């Protein structure tokens, strides 16, 4: 093999040294294998929610499952840059998430959006830990990568808070 | 100071008078203050709202209130173009205003959705008095405009109208 | 839940019978399967390619993903719209797949290109026959999407063999 | 009410509490108001420039009202994102901005622009020590997004520096 | 009738039994479009002399006002010309005609400073603005709504263009003496 | 029933009591038809025309059954605004309408435009009648509405007169 | 084998293991592409040839359409090329062969009036359309569903432009007798 | 004034004396009065131009007078570049074209096109004589632009030359 | 016939007599050869490259033959507006050109590509003769026309010339 | 001081009143940007090199990927400059000048193989990186999270590049002894 | 190393023999030198610009190098393309440039764009000599690129001319 899993080279053209490097690339591979769970349960969601709002959420689904999917091909480059190896089959990267994932049977889209905002909620907290480990590090591109993640996914969190909130336009009249 | 509040020079440019000129600034200076009311309550609306239709509801409030921005900065060009002041400070348009603004407090979508209704209705009467004001006195790039606007206003209330109407995809089953 | 996996339902807009679409279904969310695993290996050697024409080879791989990313949702969805559950997790993913899928190692150029050739092979393969599956079923619209993926899939695997042909502009004088 | 002036109820999916948010929605919320008397300043100026720079000064003053409109909204976002009640109505904007605004006589340009330049200058000493805030408080989302903000801040005072600097391409003989 | 050259002589007017617009009306309506034209061309020039030959410390902002202007004015022109065309009249058309037709006062073909050919334009654009609110008032009065809106549509892009000149010439700069 | 045909119950929002909108209606709901029967008989010569100029004509009658079409929209958005019930069904069109609709054979090129042009004079005279009725009424934004539909309606029409003008390139000699 | 000049030689057909399609199939399919390959770039050339000449009354748009249609033809061809190679077959390439292997009949190199260019480009189209609703029978036939998907996607836009110069060939015009 | 019609002083900026810029002043100026009769006439043309082909020959014909604006502009500013003051007033324009305008009657479309093909080729040769007097002159911009202007103007009067050549789709049997 | 290949008209619109127009249409006609034999021969190599730079040299071949066929358009255009008949079937472009065509077997990259390369070159020194031609005659659009194609076809030459240069990436190493 | 023919002289810095930004804190964030920019506009003339000259199989890929990286090279030095002249410093400007402040390494103007040519730049690179995570602490520190912020932009796009560079350098490739 | 600076090979591809490409190299080559001293000029002045008019000018500059930029690029290419190397770093650049720069302190804008004039006047003088030369020696292409530039060139001199002229809309009434 040209590279073997779990090893961590560093990079030279980076000037990043494969101590500094590993720490780096363990933050962002634990990360990577948790927004791609998250990327593949917010496309779960997108194809079979259903039901008087099912179109807004099937688009905002749909953008949310993107915005995952570019996260994480930043991590996951990032990791390789830093001479490292990305997880890459799917069995490795659940295998590796800390995250709760559903089972294989469909929720409703109350039970579906809750379950995904804990995944978000996670990976939040585990962001602000990682940048703030980057930016000691000295690794000011890797924190910077970081939060411009951070806030796309801290936005569509906040979007799955607002869609679960207590409103509605609806009334007892219009049933 | 180059120009005091309240004062209306007309335009030689434009060949208005200061008298007509005068009536004009009269009316469009009143709707610039309501209209910029407006626009900060949709504003309102558009970061709070919550609940099963908030995205919907939060992109259609954002595009309201880019509408009456874009009203307002066309009502206070006029005014400035007809040689008066338009009103400028928030505390003056406020001020200004004759139509209700909610408190600070949040209120619940559809009382938002009504208060927005009810100033809507108020400057739309307004509006369509003063492009009459406007032709009357010959003023056919005013009337014009104020017309141009009056149908992107209307267009919004009425799609207010629709969001508070009687009816919902929701079942007691879905429920 | 809502709908347990491997359930199909059919459905009553596109007037196929769950019979019928139980048919379909299954060869559908077998090609899910195999092509999200595809998706995967393809980001991988996006993310890992080096040397001379890697950045021509990154470049191709991830417009390759993206098509087979775009595939999946296809598939998906069209499980999902004949009443089916479409394979959600990643591990549910690797797990229902037919396809060999590589361990986490990272291995050269030529090696990793020609595992993905050998995946796109079983895919096309399988493609065919669920095309031929859909049109005796009567399902046209499944048939025609599968053929619409297949053109794209068979252009990738094509540009696989091109690029492991035995030809170079390279010469040992160059070397 | 849905939500009470002045409280804050942090939020779940962003893992923030109160306690915590309730520090940053202050700053915001701060912010938010000097932002939006800027922003109704720059228009007045914009609406009103006159004289041999007038067009170009129109342009840029238009797009810094932009800037200083989608700042704003950024700001009320994250109030509204962390559990907050973003200051709304125009009186309450002009009550709650610590900046100083003109009255409502139109002055002379290099007037109107120092003291717009004054006001950038507060937002923009405030918005630094508001970035340090967020970052104590592990706070990295709003802390990039004040920084985002930051730039675009600055960019613009900076033109309005350069703006009043004493040099022109005017020389005696012209006059 | 049979055997002229012609397919149309100037200042005919036929009106336009698609647009259900009887030749008495629409000579009414072109009369007044037509003095438009030649007025509209006559600034489209003039704003191209200007946008042409301005110079000094404001000239490339000036040079694409005056060029935008222009543009907007050709833009006019061509929606008066095709009106009357439309209502089954001849629109004026060579320069000399159009010329001869305007009632505004153009330039000699000297070349003067900013300001004063500013002020030329800015006398232009307003004997144009008044004509068009009048004709405004007689489409509607003839019930000709469609040309009285097209009119209304090109007044307010005259107006916006007639008003950035007033501020241009308007009493104020950032140059101050110390600068200089 | 939600709503029963020719029913017209105004607006609140858009400050329109019933009795007053119920003109406007009435006079929408004509034009929606005779609109909707011109767009279905242009549309009909786009399919059919041929000939020496039949490409040019297919693309401009294409264009004019978008511009009836968006046209016919307009109106009956109009109509739902006001409280009314806009003809919707192809039967309910024809019958509504006053214009003469050609029977289901193919005509030549010149009498099928002929045919087109007398809808349009139609349909010309009677918007304008209805353009002074909403004005007369003070609905300003019905009137130019009209007016922005009447200009491109004009422009059609005019088009159509001059395919049917007695000039051509063509000689005897090329004959 | 391994001393030859060439990397492939013309005619020889080698399928591909990437689309797992054996040769003998691909050989097949290869026979009836590359004939097809042959008769739309003949399609072409006259294409671009009557765009190139076409004069009078309705000329520019003609040449227009002309000019589109040709490169709808050449968009076919490389398709088909592709395809041809993606199977492991040899495209026919040059000109000379090109029109060689073409069956379609070709104008000789004077010019003649559009009546006659398009009814020639006409019975072109009809030949390629009978012939390319031949080849998706027998792409599905052998399982090569890709290829079928193809030739229907190209025969749309082929059928498309031979029913576009059978409109221009029709009897009928707004022309009339007092027009001319 | 600041310049006179007439004088030529050359450029410091472009290295060009006032001897060597006025001999390609007088022949730009010749040119921009014959361009912009030109661009009326055929703008005269588009807006009259009635029959089977109308159409086509109104888009061809603005487009042609599109071209021969921007042509003049060109000419124009080179003049002004150069020193000179460009020909500017209809009447001058008119009385300093070489070429023959139509009179204001409104003829059959060969008639003006045949017209429009003589004034072409009048400035097609003019064109020519001017680009070889800018190269001896050592102007190689002025030369430079003008074949840039002459290949857009030739291919306007070769269209012109078609659409007035013997042939055409129409029969005797369509007639 | 409406011509017959080889008479050469000139042109009255573009006042080009027959014997000037007919040296630059017998230069312009050898070059449209030319110019479509590498147009196919460019397509050859497009569709037949294989190799570890394949898909680069596919894209730029297929824009080579793209510019190929657009100078051919041209110089076809320019001939029949010069009142002659542009080389049409295949057949007689192959007989017309000068240039080596490859027989129908594929040749290797390198081959392939220096066949090219020699067409080009040919077609670049004909192409500089014919450029002098036509400015000779005082046709100096055709001039100016073959200028632009020149530069377009010796930046194409250039290309190849750079493929088949002595230096790569690759070392003996990767190998 | 009120007579000098400069308006501002090289190397001094008065910060900014409208950024808020003495000139203490100014003078340490400028010395750094000025130390950058001269780096940064040395790497943008050797990416040009680069991008000129390379040759060989890849030629066409490195071509495009040079010129890109450069205008990225350009577009970062347009940064540092616009910001030094912000916090009222005089930025380098002259090709002298730049080289002379810049700290890295300049291939002298004979042409290297590309393997050479890549791996001085990605030399480049690696300095200008190491100094630019320095220079944004040194601005964070100073409280000039605006200049921090633009430095970490910057960075990332630098580091993009400087990873493609070590990527092409790397020991694989599709070619095989038999391909040769 | 590859090539010495100084060797002028000349092309196979492009037919142009090392004795013609040297004299156009050695042309070429000072021209690059001199347009990127200006490139660099301009980028000053783009930086430092400050006062009334100062916006304006800090779009038209950076333009102005961005079109500096291209025509040095096209100028270098082309060397290169003649088996020449061109100029590169920064140093050589300035060394080899026979134009004046500035030292490094900041002037006035009008002393600014009159040292800009300048170099724009030597490079204009220049490149019109060298493309007579190129033309001479039968390398149209490279005359064509050179007039090309020349018009950028000329464009942008006579905009500074403009800039420093003698007429201004401020009057002293305005100080
Ligand atoms: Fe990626
Ligand atoms: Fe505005
Ligand atoms: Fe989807
Ligand atoms: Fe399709
Ligand atoms: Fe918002
Ligand atoms: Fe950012
Ligand atoms: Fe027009
Ligand atoms: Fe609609
Ligand atoms: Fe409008
Ligand atoms: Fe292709
Ligand atoms: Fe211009
Ligand atoms: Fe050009
Ligand atoms: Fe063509
Ligand atoms: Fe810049
Ligand atoms: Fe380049
Ligand atoms: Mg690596
Ligand atoms: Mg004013
Ligand atoms: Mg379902
Ligand atoms: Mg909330
Ligand atoms: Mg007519
Ligand atoms: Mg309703
Ligand atoms: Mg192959
Ligand atoms: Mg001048
Ligand atoms: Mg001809
Ligand atoms: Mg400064
Ligand atoms: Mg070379
Ligand atoms: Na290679
Ligand atoms: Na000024
Ligand atoms: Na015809």
Redesign the interface.
């Known amino acids: 093999?040209?590279?073997?899993?779990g090893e961590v080279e560093g990079?030279?053209?980076?000037?990043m040294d494969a101590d500094r490097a590993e720490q780096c690339v363990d933050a962002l591979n634990a990360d990577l294998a948790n927004v791609?769970?998250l990327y593949?349960?917010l496309?779960?969601h997108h194809?079979?929610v259903?039901?008087?709002?099912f179109r807004?959420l099937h688009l905002?689904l749909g953008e949310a499952a993107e915005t995952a999917?570019e996260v994480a091909?930043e991590l996951?480059?990032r990791?390789?840059?830093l001479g490292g190896?990305?997880?890459?089959?799917?069995?490795?990267?659940?295998?590796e998430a800390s995250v709760d994932?559903?089972?294989?049977?469909?929720?409703?889209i109350r039970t579906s959006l809750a379950n995904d905002?804990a995944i978000?909620?996670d990976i939040?907290?585990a962001?602000?830990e990682h940048?703030?480990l980057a930016e000691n590090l000295?690794?000011?591109?890797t924190?910077?990568?970081?939060?411009?993640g951070?806030?796309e996914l801290?936005d569509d969190?906040?979007?799955?808070?607002?869609?679960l909130?207590?409103?509605?336009?609806?009334?007892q009249?219009?049933?």
């Open positions: 093999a040209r590279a073997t899993a990079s030279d053209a980076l000037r791609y769970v593949h349960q496309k779960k194809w079979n259903e039901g008087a709002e807004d905002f999917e091909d996951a480059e990791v390789q840059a190896v990305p997880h890459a089959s799917p069995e490795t990267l659940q295998a994932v559903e089972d294989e049977d469909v929720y409703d905002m978000y909620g939040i907290e962001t602000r940048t703030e000295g690794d000011h591109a924190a910077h990568m970081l939060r411009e951070l806030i801290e969190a906040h979007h799955i808070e607002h869609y909130e207590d409103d509605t336009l609806v009334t009249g219009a049933l």
